[PDB]
Symmetry: C3
Subunit: 225 residues, 3 copies
């Protein structure tokens, strides 16, 4: 009767429960025990972006790239490899210009020229966004109220945290990520696979990521010999 | 030539047509013949929520939970099992606090602190939402115009109906569902599987559902002996 | 160590790269070499829609359908086969009324009664939208700025181009598509498969497409004999 169907549904739900829980456990294990060698730190990136947040955001972009190259030679992509690529993730749409990426860190310019919003993703990485222009509304898990952030502010999405994110048209920011960067890739690509079907954008995305990894390997080789 | 390719495409479309049609038919068969034993009714929930819709929505939440426990002992989750869980479904993002769930009914608090919107889902269940705060825009199938609803109003999403739904930031409501509740689960989880990749949220969701089912079974056992 | 994991990740990224690149190449090959026999042209559709864009959009809809039937008998669906069907694609939600479809062309009425937005899709087809009412914000790839278009304006989404699109509530337009129309179908259906789970909407969609193809075949047969 209804009791048997309730029992069966409960058994299936418990199966899904243990699957999802062990997936979370494996994410934690891969992340906490991942290597932690860092070229940048989030305070450096945030201070650099905040200093230029009063400029036009594209002038700021350029000045930030020049300063990052000056202070971290061999770790920022060259001009020929810079490209704006759409990012469809968690139900929102923006675009990125990747400057640096390794297994443990990334640096990029991010933003959107449309009003958009959705899920932030949940992964073993600490992400920080410093607003150059626009507005960034963040809604944290377990609460019924959200906060707006403005140019000059830095939002820190912490390890294992999930939020709702919402950007107004014309919102541009500098983003630094630290942790187990591969664990973000799935989230970064899901809407491309299951929603937009935009395989040229996927091509561009994996292309620039591979170029950033190759730059880091080349610099590591040149500095060890 | 083009005639043969047109014929082939038409054949494939007819295949998809009969597949989708028989899926709809099976949904109807599972739903209409599902059991219909009810602890609540939608008018009771709607009147209770409308009475408190002039309060702050969190005060209303608390008073509604207390009254539901008083009038339906053994059918509302205890305080230790109440939790705000994100809900990513149909392209929109909100959050729920489940109070009751069985095979045939559910009761929850729902809302969002971001502007969001998307598909309502289509399933064999009658859903009713009573607005405590915010605005709820509903766009029904087969029409070119939408309607806004305000605090104190109840929206009834009827069995087999599909709509577009849109909520402004700070919109909170009391939701009651009646029908074949499992048939909603797929819709409730799809964006988590194929968009957000947030497996800890999936864990939380199946956890609270399983707790609600266990409460209902425990109460059924205590009342039959 | 970290060097080996970096190498492995780079190898996997290169695999994804060549897969996506050859998918794009196959899309280009199927599209460029597809047949190019056309019943309409985009200037005709755009001029007809622009002429009536000062009317109420539903009066415009009707007058446009009457004129299209008068000028292209046997290529527009009859009244009994006209239906508003929800379209969930690329993270946005609208609705369409298909008037014409073949392997190489389509004509439909499109719009939304909710604020929505997302990815435009990327396929080997040239799409043109003439706004009857509302606003259409378009954000092109490789730029950090978007443009708003108003009633009477035509937006041309070109072959292989990807954009972000955003419509305000009450935005209605006339859409003409030219190219390899099947290559759009995946994008048109993805959110239904992986997000909304709305199989009755999928039924309606493949039903009207099949009816349009059958009309075109019937007219081709009646005109060749």
């Amino acid at each position: 009767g209804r009791s048997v169907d309730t029992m069966a549904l409960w058994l299936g739900l418990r199966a899904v429960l243990v699957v999802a829980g062990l997936a979370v456990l494996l994410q934690l294990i891969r992340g906490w025990l991942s290597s932690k060698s860092y070229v940048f730190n989030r305070e450096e990136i945030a201070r650099l972006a905040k200093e230029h947040s009063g400029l036009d955001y594209e002038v700021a972009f350029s000045k930030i790239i020049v300063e990052l190259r000056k202070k971290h030679p061999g770790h920022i992509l060259q001009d020929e490899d810079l490209q704006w690529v759409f990012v469809n993730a968690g139900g929102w749409m923006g675009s990125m210009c990747l400057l640096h990426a390794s297994l443990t860190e990334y640096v990029l310019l991010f933003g959107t020229a449309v009003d958009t919003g959705g899920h932030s993703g949940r992964y073993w990485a600490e992400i920080s966004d410093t607003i150059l222009s626009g507005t960034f509304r963040q809604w944290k898990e377990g609460t019924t109220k959200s906060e707006i952030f403005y140019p000059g502010d830095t939002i820190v999405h912490e390890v294992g945290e999930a939020t709702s994110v919402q950007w107004s048209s014309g919102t541009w920011m500098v983003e630094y990520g630290r942790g187990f960067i591969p664990s973000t890739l799935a989230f970064a690509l899901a809407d491309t696979i299951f929603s937009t079907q935009d395989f040229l954008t996927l091509f561009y995305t994996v292309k620039v990521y591979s170029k950033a990894l190759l730059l880091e390997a080349s610099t590591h080789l040149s500095q060890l010999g």
